């Protein structure tokens, strides 16, 4: 059950009752299709039926010369956020696919899936992976294709037989548009690069916990849109890609939203107010005896009540920044603020409403549908639930409210912009946190102090 | 069309004026549904070819099928000085459309009202009025023409030509399928798979809006594909039902302009002795509801020659007043907004009927012709040169082309502003301010300065 | 081969021992598809095999329908501190105008009566190779029009249905990325520039021979590269204008900037100053200046060899290269940031990774097989990826660059200790090591004669 509390007094908004799912591992495996060396050429003949097997032959060696191409390359993922510096996401499958690229490695792969069309394979260079089968064209081409072409002399047979190697071809020639496209490293992974079969299979025999099986199960959409396809090699009459699957090792410690907005004094002289915003706005997950917090609104995917985040993304902080929704003055943990003279209006929507900054002579209205206008802000920061409202506006931008359902609380207090002096409130703009604003006061009150010597 | 530019040498920063505008105000919904008929029965033993075609063409049909369930089971939705935002929801109307759909009972009135005909208007339940569009009977097509084939364990393997035809009629059903799977079931720009020209003119010729708005759409249908959504919702009871957003431009035929800014420093040679000043709110600008809508970011507005198409969702509410600082940045009316720094060094940018060069200490900037080369030599300062004669601009060892887009410019002649400024108190740490806010900070210094003569 | 060089002294590494590949040009080519005139079916009758081919007309036409609204639909992209702003199809836009006049076509087609490959001077100065990929006119023409054209019409085998759907694949395909692209397209698919074309293309390019192999061994760095325009559909030709990068600066050297936080270790909470060097990303040495590129997109790696589009780039002067080693050096005034943010982090390298850790902050560095083989003290610290695999801050975790490669590390003393911090500007100082010297001394200034009594 989600519910919202609202803070009056430092303008901000936590969306408590979320359920973490937080990546912390990965999980690839080699996926093979079986080509058949056709060679080159067509049988002596022009029959407008012969003349159509070679067009999608054509297509056939085209689509070995890409993956021919991307074989040869060097993948490499192409995907305020200074505390960020991070590495390859795909390190773990680049270095499957420099050890398939290695002489004997194809051989090792075709040992283990001669019986089988799944099983692990102990290659070279200290690793074991999962290798799946997923297609036999080496069935096909070499058997109810390559007499046709093993015939110099081919008469082309019934239609039917053009059709079906047309799709045969078809999803090999769909995966590779998208490593063609992709410079050989894909994400989201389509239902070409792993079917629901396939995938649903994958993570069935994935060694996680029956918690985190059924989870990616009823998840799908959400697993294939944070896993990786890596093309790898086309060699030996074997295509090879690896998909890498992600591994959430954390799962259902309570998360939560943060949601901020300028809190300013509402003077009505001009240019003569200052204003004060908590900015570490973002998801919050209970992580490992600390709190992991994601920045970017792109890291994390709600599924209704179950957040999932890349830990990758992430920063590692100590867990009395919730108190930082208590008390922002406690001496535990140095609050994060910034301030500012600019007092312009502003609405954030949040998980369950929308706060609303109004300043000056800005029109800011909450409205239902049906009913109409039902509440107009006055200056200064307030907050409206979702239950009634539809849509917020602050002058001509409308917001859409969210309406999912859950119980918001308004918790009451002063606005602490109250609490500062703005004569030596230090308004330029300054990233800093609580005390380090009381840092410049202290100083202020005394650079002043020290010229009242006489 | 008609465009015009002013150069503005006192500050450093060109207008370009003459566009007109049209603003996404409202969003237009639709329900766009493919019938379908529920099969799973493949039994058919056929070991002919044409079965074997027919089996794999059907396979297709319901994996795709299959992957449209899971998009049902799941919540879609958006992430859409470039700071100041509007934190929204795109979607979030097509969305509360699409949650009537999921409930129980919805469908059969669908049905009801599209029984015969393919547009209908659907009163659904608890305020939706929505039109449908039935835009394919496969349903018809497969209980009809395909049920005699598979249906009977006879099985009469009917010509190649069934195996054909029903590639046909899955097309598009398996287009949008792929459309919607790898984009979580949202998409953008509305794809002709989703919603075909005869489609969507209809539906546009058919919004209860004015031929003017009408005349508007139906020129500029690509520009309304790329800001319309379509979120799938339901397949369930033999219907495919996805939610169609389209735009709905509130505000049209009211004078843009777009707002060009660069850096504006000093001429002495002792280096890093030279102050700066940049105006900041550069973007789009137009006219609307006795206001101003700024539009700071470049992905939102789209230019097709005189028209600009902006979504007011990512926009910024100004008074009118925030023209004048395109006539005077120290008129006492609006705060013109500047920023200040000590850093001077060489950059262009190019406007609409020419570029801004700001050429600072050693650097080489030049401008030339396609015919006869370098047509002038900019000395240090900042500058300007139009389209009339110029092809490219190159600063440093950057080469930037100029748009040759026919309009008259104008080099409006005067001093640079920061002439004005005593170097020894401007504020140029990196202050992110106005002009009277600067001046505050001026006065400030002075002040303590004029102390410090005892 | 490759190195790198931690510097103990400024808390940054470069990576030395890459070569330019820098785009300075473009290149345009005129694509056309020869397509034909044909109008309504006119083969009154419903036979199973003809309404086959009158859904596979439907879509030649909806196509065509969709590419002419795309004609005159003005088309462009929207291609970053401080850098400009330009226009990354200025020079096929210029083309796709001139095939707008009238009579351009026919002087195209003139030159592609016979052959299939020429130049063609357009009525504005500037030639265009253009070159012909599909001819469907001859296909629609000659196979197609006696049938569907006839009043009577025998749909003469199933086969005629295939081959007009095999015919039509490039053309549906080049349309429909048209249409999600507002006509202009990036990477250039091969729907767009199949492999044969581009590589003739290249060949036909006026480049060096060094040039020519660079690019046909890198094809698809070359297609991320290119832009696809869609100009015109009108008088039974489809032409869009290719515009293909012209590499003009080649083998000189390149390195790349890593940085991170370079704090004090005193263990008091926020008594500790921070200062980091600015300007991090990719070098290269560039006609006597260095060009650098500040965003991550704007180059592409093979490597040891670095693809980089210097419309995104600055001309910066080669004394920037001090900034290496030495960072107080007179001759380039260099670029560095203040904070009172002690954050722990780490920096992945091209051949190791940077961790600089602080507060009670758990930072490690693992291998696979090994485990934990450091844990790092409080400062700013380095370790190659000979060994290592994984580093740890917190509980995110890294992976590091297997490529081969040396790595030296400088020992220095860290320069956060050389300032007083009474008078330090920590207040986020965007700033240079002269700038914060100016600071310090007006601080110390105010000091100076306010403490004479
Ligand atoms: C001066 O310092 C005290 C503690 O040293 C701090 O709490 C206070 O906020 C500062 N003065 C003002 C007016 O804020
Ligand atoms: C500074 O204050 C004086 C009054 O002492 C005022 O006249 C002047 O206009 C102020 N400076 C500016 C730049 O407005
Ligand atoms: C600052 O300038 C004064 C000039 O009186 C000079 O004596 C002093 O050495 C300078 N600061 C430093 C750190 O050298």
Redesign the pocket.
Known sequence: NITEEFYQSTCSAVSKGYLSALRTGWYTAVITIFLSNIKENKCNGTDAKVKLIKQELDKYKNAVTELQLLMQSTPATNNLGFLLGVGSAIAEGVAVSKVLHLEGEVNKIKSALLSTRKAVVSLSNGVSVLTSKVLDLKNYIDKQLLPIVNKQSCSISNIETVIEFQQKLNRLLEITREFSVNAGVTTPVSTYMLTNSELLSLINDMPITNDQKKLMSNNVQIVRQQSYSIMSIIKEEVLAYVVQLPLYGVIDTPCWKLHTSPLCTTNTKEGSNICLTRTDRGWYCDNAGSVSFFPQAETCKVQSNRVFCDTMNSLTLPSEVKLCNVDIFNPKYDCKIMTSKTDVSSSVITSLGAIVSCYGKTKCTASNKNRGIIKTFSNGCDYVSNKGVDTVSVGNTLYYVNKQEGKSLYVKGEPIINF??PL?FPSDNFDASISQV?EK??QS?AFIRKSDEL
């Open positions: 500062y002096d030596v009381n006061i202290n009150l």
